[model samples]
Target chain A: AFPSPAADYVEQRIDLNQLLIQHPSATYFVKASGDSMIDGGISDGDLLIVDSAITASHGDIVIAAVDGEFTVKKLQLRPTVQLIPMNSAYSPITISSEDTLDVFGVVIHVVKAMR
Target chain B: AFPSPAADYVEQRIDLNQLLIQHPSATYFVKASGDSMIDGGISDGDLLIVDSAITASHGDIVIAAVDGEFTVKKLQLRPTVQLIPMNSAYSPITISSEDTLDVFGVVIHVVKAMR
Candidate 1:
């Protein structure tokens, strides 16, 4: 079926602003700087899309403050709570009764810069 | 169960660059400034994350050029080919035999800036 519908309406283009953001106030960009997340495909110099509005869940890649420092790690809830790393080169972070861990946000997507 | 595994290993933090990016070379950001996409929760000044490597599919919000102008619209695959809009105030873009339409990429996420 062939038809010329151009006679019917005006066409328009989309702006890039419409997609990458959900809650602009809660969204921020951060760069990957360590090798601990490399097994998860996150490498140094990678850009991360972080949405503070999204609550971190078990196994979600998240930004959190452990002790007094902020870090990116996988949240683990089973068999006791821990922050697990993708790379075996790094060890897991286990929490005790006195440990204070604050989750800042969940990572939704990753933007890799090509060479 | 209370356990302090901190005595066992080193804890590390993550960089923001690791999450928002996947195909670093294929991803880009654009701004939304039109009213046509408002109903889909897309508004002016919104930031969009677009990945060039992803293939466009029916019903996906995509960036395309009709004739020669780039536009953002819904891709319709049923009941004749058309570019639909969530907002009824705007008319749908129907593809004709002579229409030269190029789908540039599909929208994945949106970042909205709050006041």
Candidate 2:
């Protein structure tokens, strides 16, 4: 068996600050603390990369405040505005006319420490 | 069959901005582009959490500039000053009296997209 020849140095290096935090001025890091988004690949205790500058639409995972409490959920904007959970155990939360829905930011990526 | 009872909401939400970005004013994100530190669990294309405010000590992985170009290597202060590669295939880089070694930042963590 022959070993692959490795390069001495890299030619193209990336700045993660540029790639992940597109809107550094409006970006935030929040630790996701529930299994509500496991179906979407976001696990509990994962670090969420959130950007407020990016506008939220339907099917986007957003960090939002529902009824004054901050939570992470998927947004459904079509027929009716609703906050949907990734796990089937939790039902979709409909946005009531009198309820307040404030979007803080959109989850761009989830980072975890694989031990 | 009994199903696991799922909770409606989480109790302890963490702010990654406070945990990961300790020195937000002096922190930087750089994409790791080499396999020199793979044995340390850092892979190529992993995003490195670098904190310039944190002081670099012996046996710490640091973002350094050797001569001029930037590179990632493990710092060994004891015995003799040297830059150690995690992959044994590569020999240890010694810091000679004439060699210019500039420690830009200390790597705090490595983040990868597990998809």
Candidate 3:
């Protein structure tokens, strides 16, 4: 649901903008606008590249969604659960005993700080 | 739930005390207090620089669990299954058709000592 002029677009139409990436190396280029992850190096206006083909793991940076909206955070693993953030500035999201969390992918490379 | 004595915590509190960061530049320090991942180079008190913007894929170390727990092991993907472990001493976690598995993120870069 990458809502835009493309949200209502479904019928497999040929829009060149959909195929704008140089390679399929990136699952999708999500434009981020926030401060929640800036402390983790994902600054405001950074473009995140999500690769579903890859695997996600603990202590790895990841793009994930809690409830519905997506966000990025470090996955901290413990003997019984996940901590969900490196630092708790934005509050650690819990993968509760009764909730479903979705992980998009890990941050392979950041396009921010690019000169 | 990394809490109390300032370490026995379970609430998803907005406690900024987790600003347990070396300014968040490096992977930041995580007192991983365990033995499940030492063989993978994830030592007892090593810092993990998780680039949530980084990508996770096959053969890469990850933080994930069956019901919900963070573990450091390489993820292997087969047709409709997962053979999860870099070596296999840690035991393979299966993505069974009848079960739910969660992946937190992909490990892009590891911030540990090297040659």
Best of the candidates, DockQ: 2
Selected candidate, larger DockQ, 1 vs 2: 2
Per-residue lDDT of A1-115 in model 1, one digit per residue for the tens?
3475555445434332224544435664555566665543347855555555566766666666656554556766555667776645666777765456666666645544422
- Rank candidates, DockQ, best first: 2, 1, 3
For each candidate, report its DockQ versus the true two-chain complex.
0.06, 0.08, 0.02
lDDT of 1: 0.54
In terms of docking quality, model 1 is incorrect
Quote the positional error of residue A37 for candidate 2 in Å.
7.0
Better of 2 and 3 by DockQ: 2
Alpha-carbon TM-score of each model against the true structure:
0.43, 0.48, 0.34
**Candidate 3 local Cα displacement, residue A114, angstroms:** 3.7
Candidate 2 chain A lDDT trough over 10 residues, lowest sum: A7-16
- Cα error, residue A70 of model 1, in Å, equals 6.9
Tens-digit lDDT string for candidate 2 (B1-115): 3387566553434344455555436665555566655644457756656555555666666666666655456666456667766644567777776456666665545565432
lDDT of 3: 0.44
TM-scores (chain A) of the candidates: 0.63, 0.61, 0.54
Which ten contiguous residues of candidate 2 chain B have the minimum total lDDT? B8-17
lDDT of each: 0.54, 0.58, 0.44
